[PDB]
Design a binder for this molecule. Structure first.
Ligand SMILES: CC(C)=CCC/C(C)=C/CC/C(C)=C\CC/C(C)=C/CSP(=O)(O)OP(=O)(O)O
Ligand SMILES: CC(C)=CCC/C(C)=C/CC/C(C)=C\CC/C(C)=C\CSP(=O)(O)OP(=O)(O)O
Ligand SMILES: [Mg+2]
Ligand SMILES: [Mg+2]
Lengths: 285, 285
């Protein structure tokens, strides 16, 4: 049954169709933000220190693996604050490590002050509180509402309810709220703070992530994946579902182009960058 | 054109159908929170002081009209903090007055510090920052993106995109982020802070407000109304659209019932309470 289901028959075609869609609708190719050796070392040092109180040891290779999503999904042309950039590198990486941990080993009393220390190092006083609150909310939500009936209801009812849940759960709201200081762009800053930024980009991020993590997630009993709403065994049902999802992505991209140029660049680089990172990364194979 | 269209032919039937839906799906009838004479006095005094720098003088009757949405839509069974309650009364009322003002007269330099003063009076340090940030975001969104292509794109594309804009624009995210301290309920606090609370309740709130404000908004050229997505002149198109909105509200209500009992009470009291207030208030006639 579902615990043994797979999208493996569709990997090649779906990858090519995602890329075809991005070339047509976004056009601008993702590029990688470059960090100097010293900047990368500072990020890795900060990640190791954040996760040290947890008794967790993590290799440089694994940190670099996680950080790629930041290097690829941010928008290099628009960056103004590289201190905020390194904070997102660190926040992103330590939250991945936390998520990959056995939940029985989550110690919020040790982890939250580390998240706060990161925010306070890299951001101004105002920004530090916004980014910390988003980080605290993400990690708290994950805990509070696992094995919750709410997750089951939202994830099994309809794509729309599912994506409503993923606005927070896939981490985009947190991403926006820690990323706006990178750009110092007034419009982007407000869209981030109202969460309209996250609401516009959630489907594009989530459909991609869900496709490439489905086999692993389903093998582990995890229900937070939109492809669980269709029978991935029936080639015909799958293809119809996948096309509806591509259509969702396209509608969002087309609406995103109504935003101001800088903001639209950042949103589209995020969705398209995430896909590039996702298909190159060992986490999803 | 659409500027002279009307849903007046449908008022009685739609009102009856909304009520029948709530009686079936929510069941628990809205009740009105009691303020003592002293408490209402305090609220009105605070309202007048906030809008005085704007040269605004407002009658008790007008303030009482605005505050009814708070007295009816909050959940009296679950109130724990009446200071937070009065803060919502004040914040709600002064935001109404701001929104009814000629935009040329909006003076953020004068108004924002008044919003901050209200939050600092009634909330603890942590809650004051969350409520104030949500008020600031709401009022800043309203300004920044008032004649924005984004608003047009979102409001005209699909119901989905429209409701995505209204999460912030109808003010529910702000409502949730100023209301959670009333209840001091951990789960509700978190759903408020992640905006999941707002995402679950926006369609119920927005569909009802939109129906009862359509005629006035369309006469003023305003585009923020879901009934603009159909031809309200065509009775069969309208009835089809209306049913689709009712189905949306019912789906949200049924998913809301998967939340913990206190949270679901609050969410449902809000949607149903707003309907009761909307149908009895002079603002929509
Ligand atoms: C915000 C953004 C750029 C993209 C959306 C997805 C993504 C790669 C997020 C990482 C960036 C952020 C803010 C937080 C990390 C949280 C996390 C472990 C997300 C994975 S989504 P799932 O729970 O499905 O885990 P899996 O990776 O195993 O599929
Ligand atoms: C936010 C909530 C719980 C319910 C929605 C109902 C409502 C009017 C709430 C006001 C309460 C809050 C937080 C803010 C005030 C915002 C405001 C003046 C109007 C929003 S509806 P539109 O912009 O269409 O104006 P109109 O009233 O003239 O139709
Ligand atoms: Mg996944
Ligand atoms: Mg209205």
């Amino acid at each position: 049954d579902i615990g043994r289901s797979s999208v493996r028959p569709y990997l090649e075609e779906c990858t090519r169709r995602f890329q075809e869609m991005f070339d047509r609708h976004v056009v601008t190719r993702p590029t990688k933000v470059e960090l100097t050796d010293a900047e990368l070392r500072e990020v890795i040092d900060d990640c190791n220190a954040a996760v040290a109180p947890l008794g967790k040891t993590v290799s440089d290779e694994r940190w670099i693996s996680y950080v790629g999503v930041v290097l690829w999904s941010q928008s290099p042309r628009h960056i103004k604050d590289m201190e905020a950039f390194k904070a997102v590198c660190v926040l992103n990486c330590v939250t991945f490590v936390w998520d990959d941990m056995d939940p029985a080993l989550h110690d919020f009393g040790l982890f939250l002050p580390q998240l706060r220390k990161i925010c306070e190092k890299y951001y101004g006083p105002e920004d530090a509180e916004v980014a910390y609150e988003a980080a605290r909310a993400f990690v708290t939500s994950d805990h509070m509402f696992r094995d919750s009936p709410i997750k089951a209801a939202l994830c099994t009812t309809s794509p729309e309810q599912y994506f409503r849940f993923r606005v927070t759960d896939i981490g985009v709201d947190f991403w926006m709220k820690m990323s706006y200081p990178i750009y110092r762009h007034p419009e982007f800053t407000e869209h981030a703070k109202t969460s309209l930024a996250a609401r516009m980009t959630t489907r594009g991020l989530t459909i991609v992530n869900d496709f490439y993590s489905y086999d692993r997630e389903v093998s582990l009993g995890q229900i937070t994946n939109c492809f669980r709403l269709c029978d991935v065994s029936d080639e015909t049902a799958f293809k119809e579902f996948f096309q509806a999802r591509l259509d969702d992505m396209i509608e969002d991209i087309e609406c995103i182009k109504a935003f101001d140029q800088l903001t639209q660049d950042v949103f589209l680089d995020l969705i398209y960058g995430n896909f590039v990172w996702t298909t190159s990364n060992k986490r999803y194979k």
